Amino acid sequence: ITNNDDLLIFAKKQILDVPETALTIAYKGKEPVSERDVWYFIHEPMGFETEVKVTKIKSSHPWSKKFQEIGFSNSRRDMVRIQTQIANQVKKASVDTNKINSFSSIAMNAYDSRILTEVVGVVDGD
Amino acid sequence: LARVENLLERLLQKNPVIKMDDKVVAEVVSRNQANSFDQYNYTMGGAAYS
DSSP: OOSHHHHHHHHHHTOOOSOOOOEEEEEOOSSOOOSSOEEEEEETTTTEEEEEEEEEEEOOOTTSOOOEEEEESSOOOOHHHHHHHHHHHHHHHHHHHHHHHHHHHHHHHHHHHHHHHHHHHHHHHO | OHHHHHHHHHHHOSOOOOOOOSHHHHHHHHHHHHHHHHHHHHHTTTOSOO
């Protein structure tokens, strides 16, 4: 990009100016929870009275008697996520260097044609 | 007192094996390792995955 407004919006997109929070709730009610519904969260001791949008569900079978785990505002850190990020960055770097090897070879290849042009012009000038 | 002995024997029958789950253990271990990794990254400025 060349203008300043696009750079400004890009820079605004490039940083996070709020604490990164992730909420997890153990729910044991009768009403089922879907992947789209937005609930109302009220929890006085933790100072919560808001609307929460579901982003992660770990449900059990209806006959399993177990609780449900529901997430909001992205997920906890975890290591396997970090390893996946590192692996995909490694793959991107590998494809980048594979492409740039061919690009450098072409730069060498593109040199010989211009060398020939210089030689032909030198002969013509003589 | 014989039925006390019978119930104690029946209660001795129980297998002393307590099956403990592995998936939750792995997930908690991963979370703690992620906490350690974030700590080490913060102490190194930002010269890490993030």
